[PDB]
Amino acid sequence: GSHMESKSSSKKLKENAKEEEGGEEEEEDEYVVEKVLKHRMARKGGGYEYLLKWEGYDDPSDNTWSSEADCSGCKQLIEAYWNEHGGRPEPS
């Protein structure tokens, strides 16, 4: 009888990796807010909401909805949308 422990010789792995180094320039080609698409009130009772219309691209009512916070960035748009409607400015 033989009480041999194990019958293994050795164990070696590959672990081979190869990578290069580069870096090309990619044009941002980002979009910009052209004007408001639609207006919607916050059912939660927060503030006002307005959709952002991409210049050149006309999306449906499922466009991007921006919070009142965006008003500080696209104020001209928020007011413009109202001006086009024919509504007077807030009470003084």
What's the CATH number where 51 sits?
A: 2.40.50.40
CB 35 within 8 A of CB 59: no
Question: What is the domain range of residue 12?
Answer: 1-92
Number of structural domains the chain divides into: 1
Reduce the DSSP state of residue 50 to 3 states and report it: strand
Q: Provide Rg for the chain, Cα atoms.
A: 30
- Minimal CA–CA distance to 50: which of 33, 65, 72, 35? 65
Reduce the DSSP state of residue 70 to 3 states and report it: helix
- Minimal CA–CA distance to 48: which of 66, 68, 63? 68
What's the token pair of residue 28?
């941002």
Burial class of residue 79, CB neighbours in 10 A (0-12, 13-18, 19+): middle
- 81: Cβ–Cβ under 8 A, 6 or more apart, which residues? 35, 36, 39, 50
Cα–Cα distance, 28 to 3 (Å, whole number): 70
